[PDB]
Structure formats: structure tokens, C-alpha cells
Amino acid sequence: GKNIQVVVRCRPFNLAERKASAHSIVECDPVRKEVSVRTGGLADKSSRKTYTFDMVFGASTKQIDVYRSVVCPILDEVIMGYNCTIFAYGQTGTGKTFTMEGEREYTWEEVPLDGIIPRTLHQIFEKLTDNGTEFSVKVSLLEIYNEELFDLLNPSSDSERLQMFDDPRNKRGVIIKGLEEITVHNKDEVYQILEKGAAKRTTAATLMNAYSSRSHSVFSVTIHMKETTIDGEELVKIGKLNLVDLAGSENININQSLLTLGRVITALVERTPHVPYRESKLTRILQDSLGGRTRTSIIATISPASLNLEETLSTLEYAHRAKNILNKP
Ligand SMILES: Nc1ncnc2c1ncn2[C@@H]1O[C@H](COP(=O)(O)OP(=O)(O)O)[C@@H](O)[C@H]1O
Ligand SMILES: [Ca+2]
Ligand SMILES: [Cl-]
Ligand SMILES: [Cl-]
Ligand SMILES: [Cl-]
Ligand SMILES: [Cl-]
Ligand SMILES: [Cl-]
Ligand SMILES: [Cl-]
Ligand SMILES: [Cl-]
Ligand SMILES: [Cl-]
Ligand SMILES: [Cl-]
Ligand SMILES: [Cl-]
Ligand SMILES: [Co+2]
Ligand SMILES: [Co+2]
Ligand SMILES: [Co+2]
Ligand SMILES: [Co+2]
Ligand SMILES: [Co+2]
């Protein structure tokens, strides 16, 4: 699977983990692209399990580093008119959202702590403006909670589950009816769009108890591009990027949707003819991207802490089952 990259990002051990008297049980090796965990736990030390992936981000890794390495070559493809997807997958609290969104002249914000989504909107605007491309950008943001779809961007949207239909004009496509798409007018409008997104998600975790923790959220960008050549020829392209912050790993039943995604990715990597797209909402919505000429990436997040051993081992196993990479001698 040249086209499907699986990478691992170990976040810093944290304060809560110290106070529980946890210790680091995971060793990352960016050069050998390995992650080792002592599976025995504490005094085992005979129990070391090692995994190999496309990339392993050690401690020195910053937000820009994940961006240049995972995202930039995918936006290249998106800008050439392809449809791509990037997943963040892992235990709650391990960095899926920090990676996808991150945190905030830069006066009130920490741009170094910006994640994938705002950096993506920035490059889109910077690259397309520089090369003289006439363009327009729109985004939708939806969440999936217990197999029901909710629009995070509808101002008047109460509650209401959106409805998804097959699209008989495309056998791989899908139509989410009523889905709001904002037009993005500048680099910084993303921040306000993520704000509106969060307010709304917060509401729905009250009147609903759909915790962003237990939900998938799908942030989709569509770019309409027109290039004019030397002679005044017009070249028209439509790119699409899906940035997905998955439901927490920990119970591995949105548990079933995660697993379906796993089989979908494994069938793609292995080229087996049976690809179970229809078995979850997430994979139906995404079949268009995953199934064509494309690039796909999973950022598997983990905590280094001994207290997280089981969920960390499971996340590693999931990512390994996804794209199986033999360990080096
Ligand atoms: N690579 C990282 N570096 C520094 N802090 C991080 C990193 N990843 C996560 N955190 C912090 O850890 C907490 C959990 O991260 P978050 O992305 O919300 O987890 P998840 O989305 O996987 O539940 C957040 O407070 C975040 O600020
Ligand atoms: Ca660490
Ligand atoms: Cl380490
Ligand atoms: Cl690390
Ligand atoms: Cl960091
Ligand atoms: Cl600039
Ligand atoms: Cl607008
Ligand atoms: Cl605007
Ligand atoms: Cl506005
Ligand atoms: Cl199946
Ligand atoms: Cl089945
Ligand atoms: Cl295995
Ligand atoms: Co480039
Ligand atoms: Co420039
Ligand atoms: Co500029
Ligand atoms: Co589902
Ligand atoms: Co049908």
C-alpha cells in the first residue's frame, strides 16, 4: 500500500499519568520506524513487542513536522483534483484532536500548536494564490454518533439527524441531504468555523450525550480550481480532503464502525475484492475517497504510560492489522 500510509504519534507522558504513578513503557524509534512496548507490563521485560510502521514520531516532533510529513504530499494530490482522506485513530486523550485541530505575527494564538485542519486551509489559500489559480473553498463538518449523522455547521439546525441516500448518479457516492457547506473566504475563517462546530457539538453532548469522545467527526474540504495557461486555455479541477477525528479506541458499538473501517483499509492494502464499505456510516460516506485513485493516511495516537498498556497495544495492533509491516532484523 504505497498509497496508504500508517504512522504513529506518541504524545508526551502527562501530569495525570505521573500522579497515578505510571511510568513510560513505550520506546519510539523514528529512524527504524518502530514502536516497542513491554507487553508483560512492569517486571516482565521479557515481554517486549515491537511494531513497524511508515513513520513513528518521537518526542521532538512538532505540529509542523506531522504536517509536512503526512499532509503536504496528500494536499499535493488533492490540489491536482483527487479525493483524499486522513484519519486520526486512538484512545481518548492520546491526541487525535490536538493532531487534527490543535490549539491556539501571532498575537492571540499559538500557530506552532495549530493542527492539520487550520494548516491545510492556510496552504490551500497560499499555494493557489501564488500560482494564480482562480479558486473557491467550502467545508462541511459532520459528526457520527451511534450510527446517526449530525450537522455541526447548521446555525438553525436544532436533535435532528441528517439523512443519507445512495446517489444513483454515482454507485460509490452518497448524498447527505441538508448538509451545510460554508464557503471559506480567507485563511483565518477556519478558526471561526471550528468554534461554531464546537459550540454545537457541546450542545449535542448535553441534550443528546453524544460525546465528541464517542463520536466520529468528519471535516471535509472541497476546492474548485481553474487554471489558465499561457494561451488562455482553462483547466478545471475539483479536489477533496477528508480530515476525520475518529471515536475513541478504548473499547476495542461505534466499536463496530472502527472495526469495519479496519477491514475496509486492510482490503484496500491487500487488494482483496471484498471491501465492506456498506457496513458502517463512516465507510459509506467515505467510499468515494477511499475507493478511487487516492492517498490515505491513518495517524494512530498513543500514550507512553504503563497505565494505558492495553489500549496502546490494541491501537498498535489495529494499525498493524491495517497495513501489515514486517519488522526489520
Ligand atoms: N503531541 C502532543 N503534545 C502536547 N500535548 C498534547 C499532544 N497530544 C495531546 N496533547 C494534550 O493532551 C490532551 C488530550 O489530547 P486530545 O487531542 O484532546 O485527545 P483525543 O482527541 O485523542 O481524546 C489535550 O489536552 C492535548 O492538549
Ligand atoms: Ca513520552
Ligand atoms: Cl520514547
Ligand atoms: Cl515519544
Ligand atoms: Cl509536541
Ligand atoms: Cl504570505
Ligand atoms: Cl461565509
Ligand atoms: Cl466570511
Ligand atoms: Cl463570516
Ligand atoms: Cl466483512
Ligand atoms: Cl460481516
Ligand atoms: Cl500480527
Ligand atoms: Co509541494
Ligand atoms: Co508563497
Ligand atoms: Co500570501
Ligand atoms: Co456508525
Ligand atoms: Co441503493
Resolution value (Å, 1 decimal): 2.5
Quick one: which ligand is closest to 112's CA?
Answer: 5
Q: Are 257 and 263 in contact (CB under 8 A)?
A: no
Find the residues whose C-beta lies inside 6 A of ligand 1.
Answer: 11-12, 90, 92-98, 103, 301
Coil, strand, or helix at residue 166?
A: strand
What are the residues whose beta carbon lies below 5 Å from ligand 10 (ion)?
A: 276
User: Obtained via which technique?
Assistant: X-ray
Atom nearest to 103 CA in ligand 1: 27
Distance (Å) from CA 126 to ligand 15 centroid: 5
Q: What is the dihedral sign for C-alpha 112, 116, 121, 126?
A: positive
Domains assigned to the chain: 1-329 (3.40.850.10)
Using alpha carbons only, how large is the chain's radius of gyration in Å?
A: 20
Q: Report which protein residue has its CA nearest ligand 1's atom 10.
A: 95
Q: Are 145 and 215 in contact (CB under 8 A)?
A: yes
Q: Are 88 and 98 in contact (CB under 8 A)?
A: no
Distance (Å) from CA 200 to ligand 14 centroid: 34
Which amino acid, residue 155?
A: P
Coil, strand, or helix at residue 177?
A: strand
DSSP class of residue 71 equals I
Atom nearest to 91 CA in ligand 1: 22
